[PDB]
Amino acid sequence: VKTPITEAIAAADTQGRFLGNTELQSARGRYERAAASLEAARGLTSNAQRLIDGATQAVYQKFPYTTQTPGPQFAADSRGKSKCARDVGHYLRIITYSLVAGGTGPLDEYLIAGLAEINSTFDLSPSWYVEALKHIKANHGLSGQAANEANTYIDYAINALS
Amino acid sequence: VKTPITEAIAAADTQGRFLGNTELQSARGRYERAAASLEAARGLTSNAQRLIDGATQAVYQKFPYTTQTPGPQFAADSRGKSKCARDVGHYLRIITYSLVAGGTGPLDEYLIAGLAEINSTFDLSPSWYVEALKHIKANHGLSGQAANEANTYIDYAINALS
Amino acid sequence: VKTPITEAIAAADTQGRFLGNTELQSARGRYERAAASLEAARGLTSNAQRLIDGATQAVYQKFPYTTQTPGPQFAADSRGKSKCARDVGHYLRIITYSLVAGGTGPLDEYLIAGLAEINSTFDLSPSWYVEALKHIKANHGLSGQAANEANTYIDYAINALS
Amino acid sequence: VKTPITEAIAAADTQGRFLGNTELQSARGRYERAAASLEAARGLTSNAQRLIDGATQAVYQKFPYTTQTPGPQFAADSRGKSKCARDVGHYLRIITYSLVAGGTGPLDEYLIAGLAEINSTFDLSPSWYVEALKHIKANHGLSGQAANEANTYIDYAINALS
Amino acid sequence: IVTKSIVNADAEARYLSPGELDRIKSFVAGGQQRLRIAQALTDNRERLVKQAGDQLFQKRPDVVSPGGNAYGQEMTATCLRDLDYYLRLVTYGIVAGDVTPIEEIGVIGVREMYKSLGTPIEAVGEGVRALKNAASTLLSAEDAAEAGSYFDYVVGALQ
Amino acid sequence: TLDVFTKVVSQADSRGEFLSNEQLDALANVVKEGNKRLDVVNRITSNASAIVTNAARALFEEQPQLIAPGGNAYTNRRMAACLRDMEIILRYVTYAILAGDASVLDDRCLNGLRETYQALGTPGSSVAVGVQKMKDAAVGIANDPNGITKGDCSQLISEVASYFDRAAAAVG
Amino acid sequence: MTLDVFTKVVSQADSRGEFLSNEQLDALANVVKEGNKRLDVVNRITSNASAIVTNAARALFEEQPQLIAPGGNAYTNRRMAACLRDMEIILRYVTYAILAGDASVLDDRCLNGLRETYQALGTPGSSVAVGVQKMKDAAVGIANDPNGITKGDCSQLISEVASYFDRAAAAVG
Amino acid sequence: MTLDVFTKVVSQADSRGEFLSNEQLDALANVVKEGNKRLDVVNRITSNASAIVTNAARALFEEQPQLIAPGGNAYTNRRMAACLRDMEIILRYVTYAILAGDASVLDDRCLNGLRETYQALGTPGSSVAVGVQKMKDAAVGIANDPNGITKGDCSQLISEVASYFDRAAAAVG
Amino acid sequence: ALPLLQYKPSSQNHRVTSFGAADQNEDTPYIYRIEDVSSYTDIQNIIWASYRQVFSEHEILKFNRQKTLESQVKNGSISVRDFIRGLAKSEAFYRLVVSVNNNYRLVDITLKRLLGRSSYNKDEQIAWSIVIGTKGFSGFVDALIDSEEYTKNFGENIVPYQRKRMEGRPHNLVTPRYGEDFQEKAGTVQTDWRFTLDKFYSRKSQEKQLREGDPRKFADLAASVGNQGNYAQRISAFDIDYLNAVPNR
């Protein structure tokens, strides 16, 4: 699965050669940034419960019909709202997973793989989840270069949504 | 040709996706490494003429028969010694080329590609060139982390020789 | 493109043989079906203008927020409502096209090919168009076996939507 | 094996999609004619014993040397004439098989597959069997559209013979 | 020939004449042979241009003289490019049947242009005449009459 | 690929006799009962996408660890994997009702499916709890009294459900 | 591409973006009656499909006899069998054209790149269209048959059939 | 072929066969120094990659409105998804060019045979480069804009970021 | 031995995704798969359509068919990817294509038949033409079927076919088994009189028809010589300063 340490391996393995200095250099790059990436993981893990209920009530604001229309898919009764905090709470897990891995791999393999297939069948509009993630990237309270770090992977999930 | 910036491209191009944060990390690594690699290029370029004639007379020491045996291949007369400083002087060029590129690419494409084909036909024993490169890696006078930097690519040419 | 007369050809062409009685039988079936299918084409062409504005105001009922939210995709101002009757009016064209062709070919090539790509980019939820097509299949006023005929292709566009 | 119901399946299976109305239409066509094809099966089954000995003595007329020349390949003695009514009696079986199947499949799989290999080895000239089948298509006594239907498959075996 | 017939019947108040419809029918009937001539001239672009330019420099050495305009490799390359342009316009005119593509792309204001460029007109014209002779030698005989008569329009209109 | 028309040929070829008259009276009922079969298939394929998710509202709600972290339907391509081939059951069951014989069903869903389902690690028995939930919705749609002239489709209803039971037996 | 009479009157009607007019549906209604006659007619071509090809090969080679004589491109035995396979592929796609009712499936297979290979190989291209005309002389002789078919005017249909051979001869010669 | 700023100053230096000069290494030292900015520019483009394409498609089709109207080559739905499946491939390789720092990886994929297919298919070639310019107007607006970032002149990167779009528009038009 | 030179790939149809399965037309080929057996008609169709790609339909014949490899395919002992190697590395295919065509055109004809794509540029045909020469033809056919573009797109058990020819001529039809430069050697354009008429007025015959002498015979030699002369000197004649230009002694 996609990781800068893995991407050095799978490039050098398909050539059948050893680890050159060019694969070695890629590994070194992760460390400079991995020191600031683990700063972004603790910023999201400590503020996790504020961010989930901060998000799942922000999507109810912009889409008020989602709490009103009676459908299995919509979040009309409590069972949808129970599956609301599950789904949005699944996003902050994988975002924090792809932070400490350094690559988009866990985001690529757990979340966005086959997302167009599932949202068409269950009629979950992807405009809902992109509205929650814009709330997360503006309200995580992170600063410095770590604020850039979470901001890529959130925005990477945004582009894969649309 | 093989470069950590190129290796980020050819990995992301065969997948048909954009540049993720994982492709970017390899490029990021090069700048910190590349600051100490260009230190190693000036250390070899300034001491270039001392190192070539330091090497081509060191190989004559360990192999004294190479100046005595009369053959087109051997360096008996002046024409071999003229082609001596050409060949060993070609090595310090490509070593300095692979220093500033950061990868083994120019070393992989100019020097060692098809080297087993050429040394069998012209009967040039590869034990000669590995004896010159051991003289270079011990007598370049480089220090610090830059001394590690030239020491990989010299030793990478050694393993491809044997 | 997909047609029972075409499907007899492309089956017999890839085998490199003539038209057997098996290839021929499919064509024979179309004429009996095609006599009742052209009944369904005149039933939709004559009631075309009632059915479009019957549909594009039925989708505004179940989704009242689509006329209220200001967005390029949303039909808030008159521009969206101008593109409302264009899009829903495009559906009754291709449904009437696939009626007289006998196959799903024109429906497969003009309408549903790459529909998951376009609805993700422009954020057009496919739950909108399936609500208009349920209004069409219940309000075309068609009867008999011709009422079955339009009801397949409408429902075939429904399943390709979700 | 080749059948208009099968040909609808194998076309839709290689695309990986469901049964559209274009595969459905082909099935109906087979069923409708199939009412006149089973008329042709009873016309050949009831007149079966008249048609076999009507045929195997018609081929002896046009080829009188086949009962005279001494060779296993030829029908000189009674053992060839015993294998005469076997072989021509095998033809009316497969013709009646391909009648009720609606396709040329049982004719394609039981009779004509590899017929050029067998007639070259045993030196059975295919001009013999085509002379028997012309006697069958003119003396079955069938009338109407069933007369047309019975003939196609007889004439399809004729073209595969030559 | 359709544009010219339409604008000629446009100047009058009436429709297209039966004579003009016969002209359009005969032009359609000869159009496939004209496409064959265009095929040959397209595929012989290089050697026709080079032979015509070198025939020009054999006839007129004033342009490649050091007082002349086409002195030097770059200037003579632009000379051959001008001959290439005119051969391209000749192929357009052979295909269309009109000379309005030749005219409104390369004839209508060429005298004032080559006056301001310092280039002599007559040497351009002699080069297009060399193109006419070369393409006449390449093609079939009355086919070469067809090609060389459009070349003849270009030659007479340049001077 | 076999049929009702072609399988009564294929055993009749193996015995090498002409087709009997009571086999042709059997096939005459197949042509007579043929129109009903087409109608049943049409309603299944038009409600084909509506069946699969409505089976997926119960295939995952009844065994809820499957979706939950750890189960084999957990991540998103894994979830789209059991909708990619929940419909392939319907893609070949509808081929079986069209052909009228399950010999085209047993080469694709029944042949090597029980081998991959222990090679991958997926629960094989957790498929056939929901293919039964498809059959409960397939014969409900098929038996509808609306928009179709009344006729007896009992043979189709019971041996339509026999194709789902064959589809559940070779997975479980 | 594969087009029809049914699908081509859709495809231009899509390009103008209007509903199908009533006189186009009266045109297609004429076609349904015609189709039954065509199936009976097209079955006669395929049942006499192998009998046409050799009977055309009794004249395709007898009229230009150097072709099978030593030196011609139909001389050796795989070269002779090469021609027969191709000769029937004309009949394989002309019968597809009469079935579809429009020559748009004919022009992708026999008319598209056939005139390019026939100067790349070295075969006489004009010596094909002398015998495809000899196929048409035998094809419309069989289709226009008074035996075993209830008399119905098939002249309107026949004209379409004859032309497909003329399109099959024009793009080779 | 895939080249760089680091590898192209090797490749011409190999063709002349000399050691790398000190002012070439001072040139590359500025490339490493200006290197950090390059990574940032790519990051903002790829994070707003999907937002650029539709916002260019809100003007590529609104300015030439026959293209999606019946008859145009962006009319039907697969066709429409065809000029979003490769509107982004322009962005897929322009971002590869800014990463490598040299347009030699751009000219093998978007500039090599693209002008040949665009007259073989029938698509308007000039109607692409009206909207690739509309991508460049949105790409340098995002890359240039600074939010919560240290401010440094990005003119060298931006002027020659826009040079890659102008090369991407020249070989299509 | 030596790695492949890098060649530029031109933009063609098949480098593109073409999303979806339920959306493509009828005219995409039937993707015959040995895993789908169910009958012998599917078994015979898989063999016959695998001959279709390799021998372009007309040749399959009787003699060309290797009956033992088809004997094996029914058994399932050898994969279809192994089965195309038996047809391609067969001397019934060597006499038909490989001897007859050139190393530069063989790269073009075997990519359309085994990989189902035409070569991008001439540089791709130039690149593999070396791999033919040192490894042999079967060494190169081995390198095509081992290649990762084959296994990703077709796989181990799927007969080849033209990928994504939405608007293109079929590859067995647009390309013969030998081109025009070889046409005199395998074909019979020498003995057919229809072509010698075309040849009679051909520009190449006029170079042959001329007697010994004329410089038009050496006109092809004059284009290959090159070496054009320098122009006259820019410097004006008048300054020359001819009176002081002469050197004494």
Ligand SMILES: *[C@H](C)[C@H]1/C(=C/c2[nH]c(/C=C3N=C(/C=C4\NC(=O)C(CC)=C4C)C(C)=C\3CCC(=O)O)c(CCC(=O)O)c2C)NC(=O)[C@@H]1C
């Ligand atoms: C027949 C009257 C003349 C003739 C035929 C002939 N052709 C070939 C070789 C080829 N024929 C084709 C033709 C087609 N390919 C297509 O895809 C289609 C449409 C579906 C057609 C009609 C092609 C591609 C070839 C090239 C090789 C191939 O078979 O795959 C031969 C063999 C010639 C040779 O092997 O050199 C012959 C004999 N030639 C004649 O002599 C007759 C005048």
Ligand SMILES: *[C@H](C)[C@H]1/C(=C/c2[nH]c(/C=C3N=C(/C=C4\NC(=O)C(CC)=C4C)C(C)=C\3CCC(=O)O)c(CCC(=O)O)c2C)NC(=O)[C@@H]1C
């Ligand atoms: C250029 C068009 C715009 C711009 C850029 C800009 N960047 C910086 C500073 C930094 N940029 C980065 C980026 C990265 N470092 C990494 O390791 C990676 C992963 C490969 C990235 C993406 C960083 C880390 C720095 C400096 C260190 C830090 O931020 O922690 C500056 C100012 C600082 C500098 O010169 O480096 C600027 C100006 N700013 C604009 O306004 C332009 C539009």
Ligand SMILES: CCC1=C(C)/C(=C/C2=NC(=C\c3[nH]c(/C=C4\NC(=O)[C@H](C)[C@H]4CC)c(C)c3CCC(=O)O)/C(CCC(=O)O)=C2C)NC1=O
């Ligand atoms: C680990 C990463 C991960 C996530 C996030 C995930 C989400 C996910 N949510 C689903 C359904 C759902 N998702 C929601 C959530 C919502 N719908 C609404 O109305 C609200 C707007 C919104 C929440 C804010 C609801 C209510 C369902 C049930 C819909 C149905 O049953 O049709 C489904 C399909 C059925 C299921 O198994 O429950 C998946 C796969 N799956 C994953 O593997």
Ligand SMILES: CCC1=C(C)/C(=C/C2=NC(=C\c3[nH]c(/C=C4\NC(=O)[C@H](C)[C@H]4CC)c(C)c3CCC(=O)O)/C(CCC(=O)O)=C2C)NC1=O
């Ligand atoms: C750009 C990278 C590059 C290198 C380095 C290179 C070397 C190279 N050295 C060669 C020969 C030679 N190489 C040498 C060098 C030596 N022999 C000795 O006796 C000494 C021990 C030793 C020098 C220290 C000599 C003397 C010859 C000539 C031998 C002959 O002619 O047989 C040859 C074969 C003939 C030739 O063209 O001159 C090659 C290809 N070629 C390349 O392209």
Ligand SMILES: CCC1=C(C)/C(=C/C2=NC(=C\c3[nH]c(/C=C4\NC(=O)[C@H](C)[C@H]4CC)c(C)c3CCC(=O)O)/C(CCC(=O)O)=C2C)NC1=O
């Ligand atoms: C021939 C078959 C065919 C159809 C049907 C089709 C639809 C289609 N509708 C579109 C946009 C649109 N579609 C709509 C329609 C709607 N949005 C709403 O708010 C309403 C709920 C709904 C109508 C009931 C609107 C308003 C736009 C413009 C949205 C935008 O510009 O972002 C677009 C993207 C931009 C375009 O070219 O105009 C396509 C491709 N394209 C096709 O080729």
Ligand SMILES: CCC1=C(C)/C(=C/C2=NC(=C\c3[nH]c(/C=C4\NC(=O)[C@H](C)[C@H]4CC)c(C)c3CCC(=O)O)/C(CCC(=O)O)=C2C)NC1=O
């Ligand atoms: C189910 C379809 C089917 C058919 C029809 C069939 C025919 C068939 N007929 C054969 C021989 C034969 N076929 C004939 C028939 C004839 N020879 C004559 O002289 C007459 C002209 C003509 C009959 C009208 C004879 C006499 C033999 C025996 C020849 C021998 O033993 O050499 C053989 C080879 C030996 C054998 O097993 O008996 C086969 C395979 N096999 C099949 O599987």
Ligand SMILES: CCC1=C(C)/C(=C/C2=NC(=C\c3[nH]c(/C=C4\NC(=O)[C@H](C)[C@H]4CC)c(C)c3CCC(=O)O)/C(CCC(=O)O)=C2C)NC1=O
């Ligand atoms: C399609 C219609 C068309 C024509 C005819 C045309 C001519 C043309 N000739 C030019 C120059 C030139 N043209 C010539 C021409 C000649 N040398 C001679 O003595 C001969 C008489 C003549 C060769 C026919 C020369 C020598 C120059 C270079 C003059 C300069 O650079 O100042 C230039 C300026 C440089 C350039 O853009 O190439 C133009 C535009 N352009 C057009 O678009």
Ligand SMILES: CCC1=C(C)/C(=C/C2=NC(=C\c3[nH]c(/C=C4\NC(=O)[C@H](C)[C@H]4CC)c(C)c3CCC(=O)O)/C(CCC(=O)O)=C2C)NC1=O
């Ligand atoms: C709810 C239980 C039930 C079913 C299932 C049912 C079906 C049904 N379909 C019928 C007819 C039919 N059904 C079809 C259907 C089709 N033909 C085709 O070729 C198309 C592909 C396909 C539509 C897509 C046709 C063509 C008929 C002809 C008779 C009629 O118009 O009803 C009839 C007429 C009476 C009869 O057959 O005895 C019945 C009974 N009736 C019932 O009571």
Ligand SMILES: CCC1=C(C)/C(=C/C2=NC(=C\c3[nH]c(/C=C4\NC(=O)[C@H](C)[C@H]4CC)c(C)c3CCC(=O)O)/C(CCC(=O)O)=C2C)NC1=O
């Ligand atoms: C696909 C399998 C199939 C075939 C082959 C088929 C043919 C077919 N041709 C028919 C009629 C006919 N077919 C012809 C054809 C002709 N008469 C002439 O004298 C002309 C020379 C020739 C046309 C060139 C005619 C005249 C009729 C009269 C009845 C009608 O108009 O359909 C009919 C009417 C119903 C019947 O005969 O029972 C059938 C069945 N039907 C099928 O289901």
Ligand SMILES: CCC1=C(C)/C(=C/C2=NC(=C\c3[nH]c(/C=C4\NC(=O)[C@H](C)[C@H]4CC)c(C)c3CCC(=O)O)/C(CCC(=O)O)=C2C)NC1=O
């Ligand atoms: C990596 C380099 C590369 C490119 C660019 C490429 C393009 C490419 N564009 C295609 C089609 C197409 N391309 C378009 C594009 C457009 N329509 C418009 O109105 C716009 C002006 C324009 C896009 C901005 C359309 C509509 C089609 C489908 C045309 C048809 O099917 O008739 C096709 C045929 C179908 C397919 O996508 O496989 C290819 C191969 N292939 C390549 O390998």
